[PDB]
Design a protein around this motif. Structure first.
Motif, PDB file in Angstrom:
ATOM      1  N   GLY A 136      -7.199 122.682  -5.753  1.00  0.00           N
ATOM      2  CA  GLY A 136      -8.107 123.893  -5.104  1.00  0.00           C
ATOM      3  C   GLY A 136      -8.891 123.350  -3.594  1.00  0.00           C
ATOM      4  O   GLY A 136      -8.225 122.782  -3.199  1.00  0.00           O
ATOM      5  N   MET A 137      -9.422 124.149  -3.170  1.00  0.00           N
ATOM      6  CA  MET A 137     -10.015 123.652  -1.613  1.00  0.00           C
ATOM      7  C   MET A 137     -10.275 122.475  -1.827  1.00  0.00           C
ATOM      8  O   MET A 137      -9.633 121.903  -0.679  1.00  0.00           O
TER       9      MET A 137
ATOM     10  N   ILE B  42      -7.346 120.143  -1.535  1.00  0.00           N
ATOM     11  CA  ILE B  42      -6.476 120.545  -0.091  1.00  0.00           C
ATOM     12  C   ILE B  42      -7.504 120.239   0.887  1.00  0.00           C
ATOM     13  O   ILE B  42      -6.942 118.628   1.790  1.00  0.00           O
ATOM     14  N   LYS B  43      -8.875 120.082   0.908  1.00  0.00           N
ATOM     15  CA  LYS B  43      -9.484 119.148   1.973  1.00  0.00           C
ATOM     16  C   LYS B  43      -9.057 117.483   1.713  1.00  0.00           C
ATOM     17  O   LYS B  43      -8.931 116.988   3.000  1.00  0.00           O
TER      18      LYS B  43
ATOM     19  N   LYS C 226      -6.745 115.382   0.884  1.00  0.00           N
ATOM     20  CA  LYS C 226      -5.424 115.476   1.020  1.00  0.00           C
ATOM     21  C   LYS C 226      -5.561 115.730   2.876  1.00  0.00           C
ATOM     22  O   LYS C 226      -5.203 115.082   3.238  1.00  0.00           O
ATOM     23  N   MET C 227      -5.705 116.640   2.947  1.00  0.00           N
ATOM     24  CA  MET C 227      -5.915 116.533   4.965  1.00  0.00           C
ATOM     25  C   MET C 227      -7.276 115.584   4.980  1.00  0.00           C
ATOM     26  O   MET C 227      -6.007 114.620   6.232  1.00  0.00           O
TER      27      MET C 227
ATOM     28  N   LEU D 120      -4.676 111.873   4.535  1.00  0.00           N
ATOM     29  CA  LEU D 120      -3.335 112.317   6.162  1.00  0.00           C
ATOM     30  C   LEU D 120      -4.248 112.080   7.436  1.00  0.00           C
ATOM     31  O   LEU D 120      -2.706 110.938   7.934  1.00  0.00           O
ATOM     32  N   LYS D 121      -5.493 112.640   8.071  1.00  0.00           N
ATOM     33  CA  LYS D 121      -5.246 112.270   9.189  1.00  0.00           C
ATOM     34  C   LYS D 121      -6.148 110.479   8.936  1.00  0.00           C
ATOM     35  O   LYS D 121      -5.868 109.901  10.383  1.00  0.00           O
TER      36      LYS D 121
ATOM     37  N   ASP E  91      -4.111 108.016   6.924  1.00  0.00           N
ATOM     38  CA  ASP E  91      -2.511 107.447   7.078  1.00  0.00           C
ATOM     39  C   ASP E  91      -2.166 107.499   8.807  1.00  0.00           C
ATOM     40  O   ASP E  91      -1.824 106.445   9.213  1.00  0.00           O
TER      41      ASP E  91
ATOM     42  N   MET F 234      -7.786 127.900   3.285  1.00  0.00           N
ATOM     43  CA  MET F 234      -6.631 127.076   2.826  1.00  0.00           C
ATOM     44  C   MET F 234      -5.421 127.617   3.760  1.00  0.00           C
ATOM     45  O   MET F 234      -4.526 126.164   3.747  1.00  0.00           O
TER      46      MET F 234
ATOM     47  N   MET G  88      -2.282 120.361   8.044  1.00  0.00           N
ATOM     48  CA  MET G  88      -1.783 119.056   7.651  1.00  0.00           C
ATOM     49  C   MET G  88      -0.702 118.633   8.345  1.00  0.00           C
ATOM     50  O   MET G  88      -0.198 117.894   7.936  1.00  0.00           O
TER      51      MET G  88
ATOM     52  N   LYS H 240       1.893 111.868  12.099  1.00  0.00           N
ATOM     53  CA  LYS H 240       1.828 110.776  10.880  1.00  0.00           C
ATOM     54  C   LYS H 240       3.427 110.230  11.260  1.00  0.00           C
ATOM     55  O   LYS H 240       3.725 108.263  10.779  1.00  0.00           O
TER      56      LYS H 240
END
Lengths: 47, 47
Positions: A1-2, A5-6, A8-9, A12-13, A15, B2, B9, B16
């Motif tokens: 869900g939201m 994903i938030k 995961k973002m 990634l930042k 990373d 979303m 992302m 990245k």
């Protein structure tokens, strides 16, 4: 869900920031190593 | 929300990857340079 994903973002930042730090560190080391190779080349002489 | 998150992302991931590429290639050059420093130090007699 939201939230997933938030997150995961977020990760990634982090990373990306870490990868950029890694690149900057390596490029800095490179600067110094170029100097060191030049120094030793001068001691050995022309080639 | 979303939908825009997934799009962001994607850009972060490109970012990245580009930084990781910079890092890997800077470290590859450093490997080369460190090997040259070692070879020249051996010729000269340095630690």
């Amino acid at each position: 869900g939201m939230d997933a994903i938030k997150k995961k973002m977020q990760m990634l930042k982090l990373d990306k920031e870490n990868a950029l730090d890694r690149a900057e560190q390596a490029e800095a080391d490179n600067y110094h190593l170029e100097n060191e190779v030049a120094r030793l080349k001068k001691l050995v002489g022309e080639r």
